[PDB]
């Protein structure tokens, strides 16, 4: 699956309906003047994938996502992205047969985030799992670095590093799913316990009252049979007020319903325990899966960092002395000595380390699309040109979209887009 | 044998061709031939699930033929009574066993097609046989009533259990057969208490049996002329209480009332006084069903003048309650009331006086917060304007100036024996016409202001109403068209 | 034979779970959770589990479990209703009253 075309209407600077097509799957770059709208394309891509942290798109709310907050004749802001599913390996779990999958997100002045899949309305959960299945989890990113955040990659907590490592092999989409499943089971268990307590406290007194009245009904039936003289008539007429002559059918129906409910509760409990063991065994397998993922990531990240910088190396360690699954840290050596503090490193050095890690996760299991937002800001011309050449020639594979202001990166780019500000709108043109 | 012992034994339970052929040979001479053969029949019936479909088919055919022959003999002829009773009891228990066993494997399927067709054919044959059995009267045979009630329940209970699964209800033949057998059970054998309780249980626990209940009640009312069962059912519905958790029960009750009102307004109208007391309930679907039932009853009873004449007081009370129900917390109840009023006003032959009240309520409801209520009010006004009694003279033309001039001329003519009240009626008619025209003008202005709405259906209905009002020459219609022109 | 039918059943059940068409009416008679118990469906020829299929099957199991709990709740409500045996709706008109320019745009 790879992006074919992108449609932006009424979103931020792109007030009008603009379409960008002929997206080269090899390597795409975006250039232009400051404030033209280069980062607005990346913001639209983040939005159509279901952004949760709104501050990432530099907006206080969805209202700021409109062209002028719905005050200058623009009310509907729509972003449409079309994908290609020629390769079955990268196909989603449930959209293999359907080709040319398109996702649209529309936000209006009053409404909030209407989603459409292939022209059909879908909830946010559908697109969320659809994008998480192809490593495009915007909530826990592994393929895009925002503007001004290339130097802050090494500043994230060891839990964030562990999450990023789990992104590469598909280990995530399961941890958050496990938490959601546990919350759902807790709520359902509370509801089921309340139902059982209420059912007991209501039916059991009623059931015993009906059982007690059963003998009175039998006695009334016996007297009625024996009738077919007045001495029986007074008791027959006094016991006829509340006898329920047809009580047998309702008693049998109530017994059948109670037995059915008991069977249902037993099946629910058995299924509960069964899911418990299944989750336990899945976690047991995931432990060694994450161990292998960590080993491969450490190896190829070290190799890549050694390749880019001849006299440096980096490698991953568990957080302090606890287990691997409780946090990860990066240790870098320059020459023949290791550095204790990561902060003393150069900004360009941190950018190179982050790029090497991203390329390592790419090598382990590439994402369908990789977004870069001015990752060369702290890097000099030589390193920028080397990174561009390595992306174009050495790696290939996944599709890259990069926003850069330096000629050394997009000079060899296969596809080049230019963003301009003509009249209150942003226009994207070829070359 | 013993009723209680065999019933308890069956209630708690987990080369046949040669015996079947022997049974066929013995029963060929006479069905009354049933020493040890009874045990063979019981064992063969207990082996029904494990037999082949063909052997099952011959078994069912033989049983049905023998039972039909016995029923025909009982028709023909009517110390020998007790052995008739024993034979009837044995055959009834055998039918219970076979039909309960046939009820199995039907819930599993469609939870194939040839099996379903074979089961339907066996059901048709068994229903024919049981109809022939119940065609006779069991009153003389069973002197005491508990034995008769137990014997009749022996036959009614298995069909009630088999009615649980949805696909059986869909087929017309089996549904019709069950309806007629239930009608004969209610009418010919009385016991109007067990059947009504079973129907209430089915309607509370299931949703698809409401139409079945309504059709059974309609069949009883038409041919079996026994409206007491419907009266008791409606009384139980009025006195029924529902929990705050379950919602399928009220929905099924609502569907049953809607279908009954669509089927037999007249029978169900008698107990409507107690049904109105159910309207105070906080349930939504039941209130909507009550409103819908009232509307359909008063609309369909409009065709017969005798029904209207004989029931003036209660129909007037119901119409007044429907008019008062135009304001409620639930917009859906208001929408149902407006729809009922539209169904009432679909004909302009009678109740001309209530037309002005309906117009006033619709104009008032035009300002309602709910959008659906506004669209239904627009629809009601459009229906009222499409056909009105104001057509005998100068029809299809509603001009305020011309009608005012005509009223002034009538006033001058009166100012200047039949003449007195003739002019009085003309003047009151012209005043009513002027009031109606003013109400329509105000509604047109309100709808013109209402044209700009978020919902598209409201806009479309407003445009339709304005076009209809423009069709008749109206001085303020051009303003509505001018406002509509800005919809671009 | 059996493998192909099992794969087709698992795929169609996963598709139904994804589209959220599973409710209380069709909660039972489905062995998707029993399919989840046996990991042979998730494990491929390389003897490694797939997290995508595992997550989809877990979602289906949660949906089925919630539908079953809802079915139990409604059955209890029906049983309670079977064993079970002012002026609030009427409100003033004043509280149900309401009380964009194309050329300007
Ligand atoms: N809510 C908004 N309303 C109007 N314009 C916006 C809004 N959000 C962003 N923009 C415009 O979009 C442009 C985005 O520029 P950007 O692509 O970030 O430039 P660069 O790529 O040089 O950082 C800005 O110039 C800004 O004027
Ligand atoms: Mg930028």
mmCIF file with all atom_site columns, C-alpha atoms in Angstrom, chain A residues 55-133:
data_model
loop_
_atom_site.group_PDB
_atom_site.id
_atom_site.type_symbol
_atom_site.label_atom_id
_atom_site.label_alt_id
_atom_site.label_comp_id
_atom_site.label_asym_id
_atom_site.label_entity_id
_atom_site.label_seq_id
_atom_site.pdbx_PDB_ins_code
_atom_site.Cartn_x
_atom_site.Cartn_y
_atom_site.Cartn_z
_atom_site.occupancy
_atom_site.B_iso_or_equiv
_atom_site.pdbx_formal_charge
_atom_site.auth_seq_id
_atom_site.auth_comp_id
_atom_site.auth_asym_id
_atom_site.auth_atom_id
_atom_site.pdbx_PDB_model_num
ATOM 1  C CA . UNK A 1 55  ? -1.109  20.288 19.933 1.00 0.00 ? 55  UNK A CA 1
ATOM 2  C CA . UNK A 1 56  ? 0.958   18.288 17.429 1.00 0.00 ? 56  UNK A CA 1
ATOM 3  C CA . UNK A 1 57  ? -0.726  20.210 14.591 1.00 0.00 ? 57  UNK A CA 1
ATOM 4  C CA . UNK A 1 58  ? -0.205  23.495 16.478 1.00 0.00 ? 58  UNK A CA 1
ATOM 5  C CA . UNK A 1 59  ? -3.939  23.918 17.106 1.00 0.00 ? 59  UNK A CA 1
ATOM 6  C CA . UNK A 1 60  ? -5.919  24.374 20.312 1.00 0.00 ? 60  UNK A CA 1
ATOM 7  C CA . UNK A 1 61  ? -8.937  22.502 18.898 1.00 0.00 ? 61  UNK A CA 1
ATOM 8  C CA . UNK A 1 62  ? -10.572 21.275 15.706 1.00 0.00 ? 62  UNK A CA 1
ATOM 9  C CA . UNK A 1 63  ? -11.956 24.789 15.170 1.00 0.00 ? 63  UNK A CA 1
ATOM 10 C CA . UNK A 1 64  ? -8.427  26.047 14.464 1.00 0.00 ? 64  UNK A CA 1
ATOM 11 C CA . UNK A 1 65  ? -8.125  23.410 11.719 1.00 0.00 ? 65  UNK A CA 1
ATOM 12 C CA . UNK A 1 66  ? -10.528 25.335 9.468  1.00 0.00 ? 66  UNK A CA 1
ATOM 13 C CA . UNK A 1 67  ? -9.101  27.825 6.973  1.00 0.00 ? 67  UNK A CA 1
ATOM 14 C CA . UNK A 1 68  ? -9.894  30.755 9.279  1.00 0.00 ? 68  UNK A CA 1
ATOM 15 C CA . UNK A 1 69  ? -11.702 29.034 12.176 1.00 0.00 ? 69  UNK A CA 1
ATOM 16 C CA . UNK A 1 70  ? -14.922 29.073 10.161 1.00 0.00 ? 70  UNK A CA 1
ATOM 17 C CA . UNK A 1 71  ? -15.039 32.865 9.869  1.00 0.00 ? 71  UNK A CA 1
ATOM 18 C CA . UNK A 1 72  ? -14.064 33.653 6.246  1.00 0.00 ? 72  UNK A CA 1
ATOM 19 C CA . UNK A 1 73  ? -16.616 31.775 4.167  1.00 0.00 ? 73  UNK A CA 1
ATOM 20 C CA . UNK A 1 74  ? -14.993 28.367 4.750  1.00 0.00 ? 74  UNK A CA 1
ATOM 21 C CA . UNK A 1 75  ? -16.876 25.881 6.930  1.00 0.00 ? 75  UNK A CA 1
ATOM 22 C CA . UNK A 1 76  ? -16.013 22.344 5.770  1.00 0.00 ? 76  UNK A CA 1
ATOM 23 C CA . UNK A 1 77  ? -12.391 21.170 6.004  1.00 0.00 ? 77  UNK A CA 1
ATOM 24 C CA . UNK A 1 78  ? -11.834 17.821 4.273  1.00 0.00 ? 78  UNK A CA 1
ATOM 25 C CA . UNK A 1 79  ? -8.667  15.767 3.778  1.00 0.00 ? 79  UNK A CA 1
ATOM 26 C CA . UNK A 1 80  ? -8.689  12.788 1.402  1.00 0.00 ? 80  UNK A CA 1
ATOM 27 C CA . UNK A 1 81  ? -5.856  10.285 0.924  1.00 0.00 ? 81  UNK A CA 1
ATOM 28 C CA . UNK A 1 82  ? -5.897  7.493  -1.672 1.00 0.00 ? 82  UNK A CA 1
ATOM 29 C CA . UNK A 1 83  ? -3.776  4.358  -1.287 1.00 0.00 ? 83  UNK A CA 1
ATOM 30 C CA . UNK A 1 84  ? -2.705  1.577  -3.644 1.00 0.00 ? 84  UNK A CA 1
ATOM 31 C CA . UNK A 1 85  ? -2.832  -2.066 -2.542 1.00 0.00 ? 85  UNK A CA 1
ATOM 32 C CA . UNK A 1 86  ? -0.964  -3.707 -5.421 1.00 0.00 ? 86  UNK A CA 1
ATOM 33 C CA . UNK A 1 87  ? 1.361   -5.527 -3.000 1.00 0.00 ? 87  UNK A CA 1
ATOM 34 C CA . UNK A 1 88  ? -0.490  -8.140 -0.946 1.00 0.00 ? 88  UNK A CA 1
ATOM 35 C CA . UNK A 1 89  ? 2.246   -8.262 1.716  1.00 0.00 ? 89  UNK A CA 1
ATOM 36 C CA . UNK A 1 90  ? 1.453   -4.740 2.963  1.00 0.00 ? 90  UNK A CA 1
ATOM 37 C CA . UNK A 1 91  ? -2.307  -5.177 2.533  1.00 0.00 ? 91  UNK A CA 1
ATOM 38 C CA . UNK A 1 92  ? -4.514  -4.650 5.607  1.00 0.00 ? 92  UNK A CA 1
ATOM 39 C CA . UNK A 1 93  ? -6.143  -7.595 7.337  1.00 0.00 ? 93  UNK A CA 1
ATOM 40 C CA . UNK A 1 94  ? -9.676  -6.796 6.151  1.00 0.00 ? 94  UNK A CA 1
ATOM 41 C CA . UNK A 1 95  ? -9.164  -4.844 2.904  1.00 0.00 ? 95  UNK A CA 1
ATOM 42 C CA . UNK A 1 96  ? -7.175  -7.306 0.798  1.00 0.00 ? 96  UNK A CA 1
ATOM 43 C CA . UNK A 1 97  ? -9.794  -7.833 -1.918 1.00 0.00 ? 97  UNK A CA 1
ATOM 44 C CA . UNK A 1 98  ? -10.807 -4.177 -2.268 1.00 0.00 ? 98  UNK A CA 1
ATOM 45 C CA . UNK A 1 99  ? -8.249  -2.177 -4.297 1.00 0.00 ? 99  UNK A CA 1
ATOM 46 C CA . UNK A 1 100 ? -7.482  1.547  -4.166 1.00 0.00 ? 100 UNK A CA 1
ATOM 47 C CA . UNK A 1 101 ? -8.529  2.198  -0.575 1.00 0.00 ? 101 UNK A CA 1
ATOM 48 C CA . UNK A 1 102 ? -9.297  5.855  0.159  1.00 0.00 ? 102 UNK A CA 1
ATOM 49 C CA . UNK A 1 103 ? -9.774  7.541  3.539  1.00 0.00 ? 103 UNK A CA 1
ATOM 50 C CA . UNK A 1 104 ? -11.476 10.918 3.998  1.00 0.00 ? 104 UNK A CA 1
ATOM 51 C CA . UNK A 1 105 ? -11.810 12.986 7.169  1.00 0.00 ? 105 UNK A CA 1
ATOM 52 C CA . UNK A 1 106 ? -14.100 16.017 7.303  1.00 0.00 ? 106 UNK A CA 1
ATOM 53 C CA . UNK A 1 107 ? -14.433 18.533 10.137 1.00 0.00 ? 107 UNK A CA 1
ATOM 54 C CA . UNK A 1 108 ? -17.044 21.288 9.978  1.00 0.00 ? 108 UNK A CA 1
ATOM 55 C CA . UNK A 1 109 ? -17.923 24.270 12.171 1.00 0.00 ? 109 UNK A CA 1
ATOM 56 C CA . UNK A 1 110 ? -20.253 22.262 14.406 1.00 0.00 ? 110 UNK A CA 1
ATOM 57 C CA . UNK A 1 111 ? -19.503 18.615 13.703 1.00 0.00 ? 111 UNK A CA 1
ATOM 58 C CA . UNK A 1 112 ? -16.303 16.833 14.673 1.00 0.00 ? 112 UNK A CA 1
ATOM 59 C CA . UNK A 1 113 ? -14.300 14.363 12.586 1.00 0.00 ? 113 UNK A CA 1
ATOM 60 C CA . UNK A 1 114 ? -16.619 12.506 10.197 1.00 0.00 ? 114 UNK A CA 1
ATOM 61 C CA . UNK A 1 115 ? -14.731 9.605  8.592  1.00 0.00 ? 115 UNK A CA 1
ATOM 62 C CA . UNK A 1 116 ? -15.414 8.013  5.201  1.00 0.00 ? 116 UNK A CA 1
ATOM 63 C CA . UNK A 1 117 ? -13.806 4.831  3.854  1.00 0.00 ? 117 UNK A CA 1
ATOM 64 C CA . UNK A 1 118 ? -14.189 4.307  0.091  1.00 0.00 ? 118 UNK A CA 1
ATOM 65 C CA . UNK A 1 119 ? -17.207 6.606  0.122  1.00 0.00 ? 119 UNK A CA 1
ATOM 66 C CA . UNK A 1 120 ? -18.795 4.815  3.100  1.00 0.00 ? 120 UNK A CA 1
ATOM 67 C CA . UNK A 1 121 ? -19.095 6.343  6.563  1.00 0.00 ? 121 UNK A CA 1
ATOM 68 C CA . UNK A 1 122 ? -16.928 4.601  9.163  1.00 0.00 ? 122 UNK A CA 1
ATOM 69 C CA . UNK A 1 123 ? -16.174 5.246  12.847 1.00 0.00 ? 123 UNK A CA 1
ATOM 70 C CA . UNK A 1 124 ? -12.840 6.479  14.133 1.00 0.00 ? 124 UNK A CA 1
ATOM 71 C CA . UNK A 1 125 ? -12.071 3.018  15.527 1.00 0.00 ? 125 UNK A CA 1
ATOM 72 C CA . UNK A 1 126 ? -12.170 1.487  12.041 1.00 0.00 ? 126 UNK A CA 1
ATOM 73 C CA . UNK A 1 127 ? -9.558  3.852  10.598 1.00 0.00 ? 127 UNK A CA 1
ATOM 74 C CA . UNK A 1 128 ? -7.550  3.690  13.839 1.00 0.00 ? 128 UNK A CA 1
ATOM 75 C CA . UNK A 1 129 ? -7.124  -0.090 13.688 1.00 0.00 ? 129 UNK A CA 1
ATOM 76 C CA . UNK A 1 130 ? -6.722  0.064  9.896  1.00 0.00 ? 130 UNK A CA 1
ATOM 77 C CA . UNK A 1 131 ? -3.727  2.385  10.241 1.00 0.00 ? 131 UNK A CA 1
ATOM 78 C CA . UNK A 1 132 ? -2.343  0.561  13.293 1.00 0.00 ? 132 UNK A CA 1
ATOM 79 C CA . UNK A 1 133 ? -2.321  -2.690 11.301 1.00 0.00 ? 133 UNK A CA 1
#
